[PDB]
Design a binder for this molecule. Structure first.
Ligand SMILES: *[C@@H]1O[C@H](CO)[C@@H](O[C@@H]2O[C@H](CO)[C@@H](O[C@H]3O[C@H](CO)[C@@H](O)[C@H](O)[C@@H]3O)[C@H](O)[C@H]2NC(C)=O)[C@H](O)[C@H]1NC(C)=O
Ligand SMILES: *[C@@H]1O[C@H](CO)[C@@H](O[C@@H]2O[C@H](CO)[C@@H](O[C@H]3O[C@H](CO)[C@@H](O)[C@H](O)[C@@H]3O)[C@H](O)[C@H]2NC(C)=O)[C@H](O)[C@H]1NC(C)=O
Ligand SMILES: *[C@@H]1O[C@H](CO)[C@@H](O[C@@H]2O[C@H](CO)[C@@H](O[C@H]3O[C@H](CO)[C@@H](O)[C@H](O)[C@@H]3O)[C@H](O)[C@H]2NC(C)=O)[C@H](O)[C@H]1NC(C)=O
Ligand SMILES: *[C@@H]1O[C@H](CO[C@@H]2O[C@@H](C)[C@@H](O)[C@@H](O)[C@@H]2O)[C@@H](O[C@@H]2O[C@H](CO)[C@@H](O)[C@H](O)[C@H]2NC(C)=O)[C@H](O)[C@H]1NC(C)=O
Ligand SMILES: *[C@@H]1O[C@H](CO)[C@@H](O[C@@H]2O[C@H](CO)[C@@H](O)[C@H](O)[C@H]2NC(C)=O)[C@H](O)[C@H]1NC(C)=O
Ligand SMILES: *[C@@H]1O[C@H](CO)[C@@H](O[C@@H]2O[C@H](CO)[C@@H](O)[C@H](O)[C@H]2NC(C)=O)[C@H](O)[C@H]1NC(C)=O
Ligand SMILES: *[C@@H]1O[C@H](CO)[C@@H](O[C@@H]2O[C@H](CO)[C@@H](O)[C@H](O)[C@H]2NC(C)=O)[C@H](O)[C@H]1NC(C)=O
Ligand SMILES: *[C@@H]1O[C@H](CO)[C@@H](O[C@@H]2O[C@H](CO)[C@@H](O)[C@H](O)[C@H]2NC(C)=O)[C@H](O)[C@H]1NC(C)=O
Ligand SMILES: *[C@@H]1O[C@H](CO)[C@@H](O)[C@H](O)[C@H]1NC(C)=O
Ligand SMILES: *[C@@H]1O[C@H](CO)[C@@H](O)[C@H](O)[C@H]1NC(C)=O
Ligand SMILES: *[C@@H]1O[C@H](CO)[C@@H](O)[C@H](O)[C@H]1NC(C)=O
Ligand SMILES: *[C@@H]1O[C@H](CO)[C@@H](O)[C@H](O)[C@H]1NC(C)=O
Lengths: 328, 239, 41, 45
């Protein structure tokens, strides 16, 4: 998903002026249409977040006795002690993306936007709720394999699930049994290398950060355009209304209405086109949740490089991270 | 067959009873209708001209007055078409994506069977039936769903004459007294045999391997064939 | 006596799985289910 | 048990000779040694 944005077209074009509001009604539905367009984007963020994470209508939980055959999921399962129940790798993910306004009340670029009739609306699902849906997906995966996708969750021992996987890639199930300490050690060691990567490099989350940076850059650009004159005697609306009577003010204000309205149509077009990029990505992530997490995929390089075994979802700021496990 | 026939019945009764189900197709029909009405209502807007009616400019003003007012209507109107065509291009990109997905589900769920979990309905995909709809497609996906489960004790492998044994397909299970072999998606237990299983390695390496005798379907077929032969030798005391 | 309530949403029923290092569940029966899915074209 | 038959040795490009073991074989031929000593012993009474 991306940050939900609500703009009041009238408060942006016409900051507290009756004169400018009466001139803005000469355009008619243009102001409402641009709020309808941004509302269609704001609503499908919650849809995209539902499609990706709300794949199970039941919240699976891991047992207290972690006897997963030697496979140590403790760095990707929930942490009880942390104030939000995210995993250890999920906490790194939340530190490694930077936000321009989360939308959670005020009591600086966040301030400049709000002073100009631009607002960020909060997501429906909190970052605790995405951590809980991720816990359900991961606990269903560790304890039940693909079966919680196809119906009710059926328990299976984790090393026995991994055996079904191995048969799934055309390797005989005794190749697991005869090597289970090695396979668990390699898995545990590879979950270790995820941290020693993400802890130390800045660029790894770059797809999520670039999505945040564009919504920030575009809101900054829509803030800046209020400084354009558009051929009026000032960029500032009150300075026109102060220095001119109605018969001359209407000519000047009509320029600023025209230029600000063309600026909003640009923002809303850029945001609708961008919103298509995110919907394609949400449909991809919901498909990868369905086919790499809730299952095993025989689709080459669809679930990470190598022969796919299984995958684990993680919550991230406005995104998902998939830890794909592959036999190479 | 009865479950399928009844489920097709529940589709008829669902699409009779509920209002909202076609809400995707209805929302597409509403979007293009509302956009066309928005485009026509935008003709009544002045854009700062002395009227939106074109003749009320052309009569009530002279040529070089009127051209300044008519150019407001031309500007505003042209921007109204550019907005409608931008909204329709962006809309058409969503319907395209949805048509390429529908063509993919026609290819993979209707012309085939999908091993892609949750792609062709929820559950294990069996088959799908297409139905036409106004500006859309409806798929009736048919899926097999596991229903009444029982718990069982299980094991990674079985030991017999000091070698380990593993299922060829399926899994081992125990009802508490006897071990069986069964297919991993439906409970149909069988006596564990050398035809259900294959062998690899000695009994030490497999974590969690138990002890349970394995049957050999060649064996009593040879051993009864020892008593027949044994009977011959008894006969051969007599002649 | 009806009124608009407001609440923090629940994400589903809480359900710990019966997991153990030697326990399996197997379905003795199944349902055929038919689900409609609708796409604009 | 590891292999299946189809056709004869002329048609397949790049085919090679090797022996193919049958696991029924010594399981019957041991049952011939189990028989032969019984026939030899049953000469003795
Ligand atoms: C685990 O599954 C086993 C196989 O179904 C089952 O063992 C079977 O139990 C029945 C009795 O409930 C036996 O049936 C025979 O019993 C006597 C034998 O003289 C006859 O009067 C009956 O007509 C019938 O032939 C089966 O022989 C027996 N099979 C085996 C292989 O021993 C267990 O009872 C099940 N255990 C649990 C805990 O449910
Ligand atoms: C499954 O069946 C196996 C075969 O019966 C059984 O292995 C046997 O286990 C016992 C106890 O550990 C061994 O007993 C001997 O132990 C040492 C020699 O290793 C001696 O000092 C003792 O006096 C005694 O003779 C058997 O030797 C051993 N058999 C083999 C072939 O190694 C498993 O223990 C059984 N497991 C379960 C879970 O039942
Ligand atoms: C693979 O093993 C085969 C079995 O030993 C062997 O086939 C044999 O090849 C020879 C030489 O070509 C044939 O010899 C006979 O050929 C004709 C009759 O068919 C006569 O005119 C000859 O005088 C001679 O008797 C064998 O008949 C043939 N045996 C069979 C059962 O086909 C292959 O040559 C071996 N090939 C390799 C690459 O190892
Ligand atoms: C599968 O078994 C679990 C619990 O394990 C069993 O516990 C003993 C009482 C005995 O039955 C043993 O053979 C097993 O080891 C079941 O989980 C319980 O479900 C009930 C509600 O039905 C609930 O009150 C308990 O608190 C649950 N216990 C735990 C630890 O989760 C599970 O329901 C069984 N599966 C089926 C299909 O019935
Ligand atoms: C799973 O891996 C974690 C991380 O290596 C293990 O947790 C460590 O356990 C040791 C020994 O008790 C402590 O010294 C460390 O401080 C722990 N680190 C953390 C992050 O908790 C855990 O013990 C492993 N699980 C098993 C079953 O071996
Ligand atoms: C809503 O606004 C009020 C201030 O009008 C905030 O109340 C203050 O909260 C801080 C921090 O807890 C206290 O130190 C002050 O003493 C409070 N002042 C008053 C007048 O009560 C309140 O925190 C705000 N709430 C939110 C969610 O923004
Ligand atoms: C398969 O490769 C693994 C490494 O991925 C080998 O495991 C290592 O073996 C050496 C000794 O040969 C040890 O020093 C390492 O500690 C082992 N690594 C791990 C992760 O356990 C393994 O020996 C190879 N197996 C075979 C049959 O060749
Ligand atoms: C599998 O479940 C089906 C229902 O989903 C069972 O079929 C029903 O059985 C009851 C009697 O037990 C009948 O009254 C119903 O009329 C049956 N319905 C249908 C559609 O036939 C079935 O008995 C179960 N099978 C097993 C082996 O447990
Ligand atoms: C399974 O767990 C029990 C404790 O619940 C333990 O006694 C047993 O040794 C374990 N067996 C295996 C094969 O891990
Ligand atoms: C014993 O063998 C003879 C042939 O040598 C046969 O005629 C006779 O029917 C046999 N009787 C029995 C009881 O096997
Ligand atoms: C492989 O091809 C070469 C010719 O390029 C030929 O001499 C050789 O006998 C062939 N070997 C096999 C196993 O087909
Ligand atoms: C020989 O046959 C007799 C039965 O007539 C049997 O008691 C004895 O054990 C046999 N001996 C051998 C070495 O087979």
């Amino acid at each position: 998903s991306m940050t939900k944005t609500s703009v009041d077209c009238t408060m942006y074009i016409c900051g507290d002026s009756t004169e400018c509001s009466n001139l803005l009604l000469q355009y008619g539905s243009f102001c409402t249409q641009l709020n309808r367009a941004l509302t269609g984007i704001a609503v499908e963020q919650d849809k995209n977040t539902q499609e990706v994470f709300a794949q199970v209508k039941q919240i699976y939980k891991t047992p207290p006795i972690k006897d997963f055959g030697g496979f140590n999921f403790s760095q990707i399962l929930p942490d009880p002690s942390k104030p939000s129940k995210r995993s250890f790798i999920e906490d790194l993910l939340f530190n490694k993306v930077t936000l321009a306004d989360a939308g959670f009340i005020k009591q600086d670029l966040i301030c400049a936007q709000k002073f100009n009739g631009l607002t960020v609306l909060p997501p429906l699902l909190t970052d605790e709720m995405i951590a809980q849906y991720t816990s359900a997906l991961l606990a269903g995966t560790i304890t039940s394999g693909w079966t919680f996708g196809a119906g009710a969750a059926l328990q299976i021992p984790f090393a026995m699930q991994m055996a079904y996987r191995f048969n799934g890639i055309g390797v005989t199930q005794n190749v697991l049994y005869e090597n289970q300490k090695l396979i668990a050690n390699q898995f545990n060691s590879a979950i270790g290398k995820i941290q020693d990567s993400l802890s130390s490099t800045a660029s790894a989350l770059g797809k999520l950060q670039n999505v945040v940076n564009q919504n920030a850059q575009a809101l900054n650009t829509l803030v800046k355009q209020l400084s354009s004159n558009f051929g009026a005697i000032s960029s500032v609306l009150n300075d026109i209304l102060s220095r001119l009577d109605k018969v001359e003010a209407e000519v000047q204000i009509d320029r600023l209405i025209t230029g600000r309205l063309q600026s909003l149509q640009t923002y809303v077009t850029q945001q609708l086109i961008r919103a298509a990029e995110i919907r394609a990505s949400a449909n991809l992530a919901a498909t990868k949740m369905s086919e790499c997490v809730l299952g095993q995929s025989k689709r080459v390089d669809f679930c990470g490089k190598g022969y796919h075994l299984m995958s684990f979802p993680q919550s991230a700021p406005h995104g998902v991270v998939f830890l794909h496990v592959t036999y190479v | 067959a009865n479950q399928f026939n009844s489920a097709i019945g529940k589709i008829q009764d669902s699409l009779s009873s509920t209002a909202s189900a076609l809400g995707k197709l209805q929302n597409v029909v509403n979007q293009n209708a509302q956009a066309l009405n928005t485009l026509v209502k935008q003709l009544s807007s002045n854009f700062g001209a002395i009227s939106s009616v074109l003749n009320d400019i052309l009569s009530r003003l002279d040529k070089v007055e009127a051209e300044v007012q008519i150019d407001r209507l031309i500007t505003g109107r042209l921007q109204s078409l550019q907005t409608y065509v931008t909204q329709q291009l962006i809309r058409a990109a969503e319907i395209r994506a949805s048509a390429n997905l529908a063509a993919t589900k026609m290819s993979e769920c209707v012309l085939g069977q999908s091993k892609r979990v949750d792609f062709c309905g929820k559950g294990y995909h069996l088959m799908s039936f297409p139905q036409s709809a106004p500006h859309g497609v409806v798929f009736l996906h048919v899926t097999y769903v596991p229903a009444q489960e029982k718990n069982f004790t299980t094991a990674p492998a079985i030991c017999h004459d000091g070698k380990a044994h593993f299922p060829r397909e399926g899994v081992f299970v125990s009802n508490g007294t006897h071990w069986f072999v069964t297919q991993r998606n439906f409970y149909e237990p069988q006596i564990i045999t050398t035809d259900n299983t294959f062998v690899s390695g000695n009994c030490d390496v497999v974590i969690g391997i138990v002890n349970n005798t394995v049957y050999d379907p060649l064996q009593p077929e040879l051993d009864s064939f020892k008593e027949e032969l044994d009977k011959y030798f008894k006969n051969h005391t007599s002649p | 006596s009806q009124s608009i309530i407001a609440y923090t949403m629940s994400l589903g029923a809480e359900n710990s799985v019966a997991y153990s290092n030697n326990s399996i569940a197997i379905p003795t029966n199944f349902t055929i289910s038919v689900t409609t899915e609708i796409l604009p074209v």
